[PDB]
Amino acid sequence: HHHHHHEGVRTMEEECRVLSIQSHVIRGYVGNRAATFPLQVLGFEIDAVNSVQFSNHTGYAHWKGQVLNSDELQELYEGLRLNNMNKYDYVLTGYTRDKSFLAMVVDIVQELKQQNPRLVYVCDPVLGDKWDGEGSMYVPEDLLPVYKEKVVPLADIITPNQFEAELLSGRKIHSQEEALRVMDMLHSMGPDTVVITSSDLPSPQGSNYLIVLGSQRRRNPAGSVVMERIRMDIRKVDAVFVGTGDLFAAMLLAWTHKHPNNLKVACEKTVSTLHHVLQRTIQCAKAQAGEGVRPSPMQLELRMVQSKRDIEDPEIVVQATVL
Amino acid sequence: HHHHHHEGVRTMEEECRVLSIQSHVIRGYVGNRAATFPLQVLGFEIDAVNSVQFSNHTGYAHWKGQVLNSDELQELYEGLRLNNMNKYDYVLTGYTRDKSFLAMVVDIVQELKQQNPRLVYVCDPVLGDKWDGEGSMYVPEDLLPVYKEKVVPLADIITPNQFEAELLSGRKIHSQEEALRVMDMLHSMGPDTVVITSSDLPSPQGSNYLIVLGSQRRRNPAGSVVMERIRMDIRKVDAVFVGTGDLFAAMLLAWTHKHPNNLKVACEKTVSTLHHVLQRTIQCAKAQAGEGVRPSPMQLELRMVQSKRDIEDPEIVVQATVL
């Protein structure tokens, strides 16, 4: 009787409120631009709170705009508290330069979590990474002291990359047997799901064929804790991409929310989704500028719209191994 | 050759870019939050300058946020130019309440056109409505002289509710046919494509149906203003909806693009879309509140995400009538 299944259309499903306090640009896709469409095309009731609003990202030679301040995001957040619209399922965080905006973000994550003990604060540390081998931070020299004790302790999910992963532990990674150790070192700070978005640790398939690894505990079982882990390698989509960071944690949110406590398929639909993007991204970068040389930011921007088709459900292009 | 067609995974499908300058909200869907999503799902690359970042729409007892402004808008545009990327296709505007700001829109829409031979400014003359009998405006005096003498002259697709047309001309609408006389003064000055999305002209039929008067007037071979006239009945709705005009223009612009000089399925696909979306934002509103109780300021937030597919393929529940 497939006839009472259609009046289901009339039902109240779930509203998965996602407070995503990130940046917004006019042209291009970084931060919140990058985090919404996907999360929306995936049924999430996501709310965007601009941190900035630059004409474009800071990856081009120029940019102009404004930077929302702590005092502003404070008013911004109360307005909600007033008409009582301050209650989320997931608070999503990312790249942030100023320290006061970071403490404020916390407070909001903090109260939201005192207004809702159930909140899932998917947190992605704005620390920095490595370009010509050596590694540098990409923010003020005292953002870590904040990320260390008031952010990560509050977060339920983090997506460090090697350089940052290390910084949120105090040790350092030289092998595969340490990015799991340092991952053990981060839950003690709080995150119960830890992934190391990028690194340098080799793999049975080359340096080009880069890695991804992660761990997820839950001492929820009657007695003690249980802990599952995975890892995976992915050819290096050579081309240089910016926004990808922001999108990762988003899709690593959706798929996470949508599936059981198994980073495996969760992480597979996720790290895969980046592929059905980037491919269709690199491909066009060359579709126009002089049939004889490497592209530019604008000739390289994330072809995000076009990926709707794919976003709604990816064709797994990479497999993972269980541990 | 059913395999040389799947190839075309490389074919470049150009940027039907867009530059919507409307409002943004950290909850709810209105302005760019109701306008954005859909055009993005339709391969349109909407970019959202956000004239305002409020926590929520102005129907709530409270609402706080920060307003963009003259120079603050001017700079967003200045950046976009330093990367010599100002080249666009459309410009979608709406409820603006600052002449100083609007004149910035128009000044901006200028270099944008001297640049492109076939742009398409789609302006929504947000000025006012009608309570139970008479009319009236919710925008300061400053602005009416400007849309008259400034904006409309550059518009190309305007969507005046009946009043705004009357208020845009100072020419009350008598017989529906007079509406077709005002429209041509409107046509006369810019809009080669007026769409009186809303009006009061009694449909010969019923007494709860929106009359929408469309008019796309451009030419064939020689200098001959072929005109396309239209009307279609609209069962109305049961509540204080928001973002509809924004959702309406957002998509009038949409369809009017795959079917240029075929305004018929233009005001066609659009309309059934407010339909499906409204009857669903309300279909469930039926249960989201009390069993026999009225929807609140937030429960009545349009449901844009949960209408994803609807947006791609609007079953046209309303057939156009030429005149």
Swiss-Prot record, chains A, B:
The record's GO CC annotations read: cytosol; extracellular exosome; extracellular region; nucleoplasm; nucleus; secretory granule lumen; specific granule lumen
Where would you find this protein in the cell? Cytoplasm, Cytosol
Q: How is the cofactor bound?
A: Zn(2+) is the most effective divalent metal cation in vitro, followed by Co(2+), Mn(2+) and Mg(2+).
Give residue numbers for the modification (Phosphoserine).
S70, S175, S224, S296
What are the GO MF terms of this UniProt record? ATP binding; lithium ion binding; magnesium ion binding; potassium ion binding; protein homodimerization activity; pyridoxal kinase activity; pyridoxal phosphate binding; sodium ion binding
Annotated residues for binding of pyridoxal 5'-phosphate: T58, G245, D246
**UniProt cross-references to Gene3D superfamilies, sorted A to Z:** 3.40.1190.20
Q: Where is the active site?
A: D246 (proton acceptor)
Pathological condition linked to this protein in its record: Neuropathy, hereditary motor and sensory, 6C, with optic atrophy: An autosomal recessive neurologic disorder characterized by childhood onset of axonal, sensorimotor polyneuropathy affecting mainly the lower limbs, and adult-onset optic atrophy. Clinical features include progressive distal muscle weakness and atrophy, significant standing and walking difficulties, areflexia, neurogenic pain and progressive visual impairment.
Would you tell me the protein name for this molecule? Pyridoxal kinase
User: What is the protein's species of origin?
Assistant: Homo sapiens (Human)
Gene responsible for this protein? PDXK
